[PDB]
Amino acid sequence: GKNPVMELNEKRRGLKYELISETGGSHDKRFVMEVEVDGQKFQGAGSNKKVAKAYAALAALEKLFPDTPL
């Protein structure tokens, strides 16, 4: 375990990550990603899409799979 998207995928396959926010200039960009798991929405933010997506998965894992080793 180490990659949030990878670990969540082990619990739920075919999840779709949606970019819901992209703001700030090329020097202060902020991305917000959202993932839906069991009708529940989880979001993650960051300076780039990859980490925003990872935080979105982490949020899902922290709620639904607390024991999953990071």
Scan for tokens 């960009």, then name that residue: 29
Separation between Cα atoms, residue 24 and residue 48, nearest integer Å = 12
Q: Return the SS3 of 69.
A: coil
Q: Where are the domains of the chain?
A: 1-70
CA distance 30 to 67: 29
Q: Which residues contact 13 (CB under 8 A, 6 or more apart)?
A: none
CATH number of 1-70: 3.30.160.20
Task: Return the bridge partners of 36, or none.
Answer: 41
Strand, helix or coil for residue 34: strand
